[PDB]
């Protein structure tokens, strides 16, 4: 038993990370088939990033302006292109380590694993969630640009995130792998704030079910509530509304414990009243909202890849 | 910026995970060169888990009593032997994916990554710490025995933990890769219980420094302490004594932030007395003790 925040094994993705340098900027690239993906702002100068004209910045560059380095082997670039905010670099040779993969775009409240890299060499791996305000609370230092997020289904890697920038609030912003930003963000050095975060309600309830599956029962109670009554108290504590589809998805965990979702909502309702104040659940003094229902089930049932 | 519990990239260990079957029991093994390592209790039957004599069980075994699978491939065992609590299966093929590696024995407070596996197949990776009572607070369903913990430095994998057992209290015990248990535990299913656990004080201080490095100072105060008066207070909160060696270990983080170690000790002293008062540190509403001083500089 036990319950930790668990990242997907990262080996399928480790073999796809390369170093991409365009004139004194260096960040990370994703090498799949014969194409290397990376943030388009790698073509920006430290003076062009205030208000970049990306059409004109790319039309000036040609293939020789990009050095791609896979470990210590140089990759010769034979074509360059832009799709939304990602730069596509076509290379001489295809990646022999290319996994079965698929570009997907995730909803807020879904989790994924991030392979943090620096100069194209993977450094660490962690589990994070796409926040309702479309940021992630990651760990990224200078030169982590281009690190990707992903999930694994059987043997297929779903790439869902590429890291572009840090917001002044410390949180991070990026795109899917087709270059579309998550959230209302642009790739410029301009003041950009995110909306007020809210809490992913359905993940909080799923984590509470993982608590009772591990013996933590002191927060339970008998009084049920209505969906309308709960959504009103969720409104006041900046919790996301709980939809009827969230209750259905929580169906499995409601069975495995015999606690109705709306019973758990009163447990969560009362926990939102005067709090925990040092009282803990699964070793946490706050309510954790970065575990999906599928995460709770895949860890309380041992699915591998 | 940002500070997260971060595991090492698991790719170099994924290539070493195999499945070891003996009689009716299947667990994970570690295929390095032409040797496979697994917990020795793989040779136990149902009447063999209270008081097994492992020497007697192993002498009755032929090579073909051990089935080893690496994916679809069946590896042929050409010899077996035992080192403390680890069984070593010599196979006819050296693992082509064997990384540069070392076996190391860690000390309480040290962190490592766990590659949880089921049936030789890697399921997930996470960071955890060797607790002062020599257990780990892992995530380990049945049939995850033989999952290993590790660190990676440059491109050399230091293996430090093999999982063997879950204890009545829900926490986990295992050995180094020479088969010697961490703590006073034996691979028998007779009643065993971990000693009382304590917070890893030197790790909490490193995490406070990491909070200052990431831009939070609200928990500092104007006070200092002596090493002795800190230890007298901390132990009333179930905290590990802070030795002189620990404060030397925190010297680099101290120089980087400009805050003396004993001043941060006064800070921790007050946090234990007051709580957070509705605030959080690096995303947490309690004091975090599974980040070493080395973990902190690698992530900041
Ligand atoms: C990922 C490392 C990093 O922070 N930088 C700094 C930059 N931030 C932005 C934001 C918007 C557009 C362009 C850039 S560059 C990097 C060198 C890559
Ligand atoms: C690998 C699964 C696991 O940990 N267990 C618990 C066991 N403890 C011991 C102790 C001594 C000898 C053998 C075993 S197995 C089991 C499913 C059985």
């Amino acid at each position: 038993s036990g319950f930790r925040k668990m990242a997907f094994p990262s080996g399928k993705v480790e073999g796809c990370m390369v170093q991409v340098t365009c004139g004194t900027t260096t960040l990370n690239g994703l090498w799949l088939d014969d194409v290397v993906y990376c943030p388009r702002h790698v073509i920006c100068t430290s003076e062009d990033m205030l208000n970049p004209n990306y059409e004109d910045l790319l039309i000036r560059k040609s293939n020789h302006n990009f050095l791609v380095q896979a470990g210590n082997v140089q990759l010769r670039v034979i074509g360059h292109s832009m799709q939304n905010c990602v730069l596509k670099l076509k290379v001489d040779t295809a990646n022999p380590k290319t996994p079965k993969y698929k570009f997907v775009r995730i909803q807020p409240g879904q989790t994924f694993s991030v392979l943090a890299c620096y100069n194209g060499s993977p450094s660490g791996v962690y589990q994070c969630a796409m926040r309702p305000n479309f940021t992630i609370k990651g760990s990224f230092l200078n030169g982590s640009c281009g690190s990707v997020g992903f999930n694994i289904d059987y043997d297929c890697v779903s790439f869902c995130y590429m890291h572009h920038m840090e917001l002044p609030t410390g949180v991070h912003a990026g795109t899917d792998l087709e270059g579309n930003f998550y959230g209302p963000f642009v790739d410029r050095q301009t003041a950009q704030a995110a909306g007020t975060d809210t809490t992913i309600t359905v993940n909080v309830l799923a984590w509470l079910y993982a608590a009772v599956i591990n013996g933590d029962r002191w927060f339970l109670n008998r009084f049920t509530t209505t969906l309308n009554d709960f959504n009103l108290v969720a409104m006041k504590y900046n919790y996301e509304p709980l939809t009827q589809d969230h209750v259905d998805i929580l169906g499995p965990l409601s069975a495995q414990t015999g606690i109705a979702v709306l019973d758990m909502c009163a447990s969560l309702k009362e926990l939102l009243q005067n709090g925990m104040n040092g009282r803990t659940i699964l070793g946490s003094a706050l309510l954790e909202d970065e575990f999906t229902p599928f995460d709770v089930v895949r860890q309380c049932s041992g699915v591998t890849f």
Side-chain angles (χ1 to χ4, degrees), chain A residues 31 34-35 73-79 89-94:
Chain A
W31 179 24
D34 62 338
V35 176
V73 166
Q74 315 292 342
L75 290 191
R76 154 161 178 258
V77 181
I78 66 181
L89 297 189
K90 187 192 186 52
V91 293
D92 48 3
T93 18

Side-chain angles (χ1 to χ4, degrees), chain A residues 151-291:
Chain A
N151 294 84
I152 301 195
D153 291 288
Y154 208 145
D155 70 329
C156 180
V157 183
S158 300
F159 295 101
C160 61
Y161 178 84
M162 170 177 277
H163 178 63
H164 287 257
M165 65 203 204
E166 175 184 324
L167 303 181
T169 163
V171 305
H172 299 109
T175 62
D176 65 20
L177 255 96
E178 303 175 48
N180 307 120
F181 261 100
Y182 294 91
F185 302 118
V186 301
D187 41 342
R188 292 140 66 157
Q189 206 79 298
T190 64
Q192 313 193 48
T196 51
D197 221 4
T198 57
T199 291
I200 309 156
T201 306
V202 65
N203 292 7
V204 171
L205 292 164
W207 170 84
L208 291 186
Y209 279 109
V212 304
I213 291 177
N214 285 261
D216 293 58
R217 295 182 160 261
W218 69 274
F219 54 84
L220 292 179
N221 81 333
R222 10 109 143 263
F223 320 103
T224 158
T225 192
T226 66
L227 195 53
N228 288 6
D229 284 328
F230 176 72
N231 281 328
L232 230 28
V233 39
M235 182 114 44
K236 178 45 61 210
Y237 292 99
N238 274 1
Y239 270 55
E240 280 290 293
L242 178 79
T243 76
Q244 178 49 37
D245 210 349
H246 292 144
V247 177
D248 301 330
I249 287 176
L250 292 164
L253 300 178
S254 184
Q256 203 150 42
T257 76
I259 316 163
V261 170
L262 304 97
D263 277 329
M264 198 65 86
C265 288
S267 309
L268 176 54
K269 197 183 116 59
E270 311 319 309
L271 276 161
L272 295 171
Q273 246 62 282
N274 256 130
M276 271 162 308
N277 325 311
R279 281 266 39 198
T280 75
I281 296 177
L282 294 170
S284 170
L286 49 76
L287 299 167
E288 298 289 338
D289 80 325
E290 297 201 350
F291 290 88

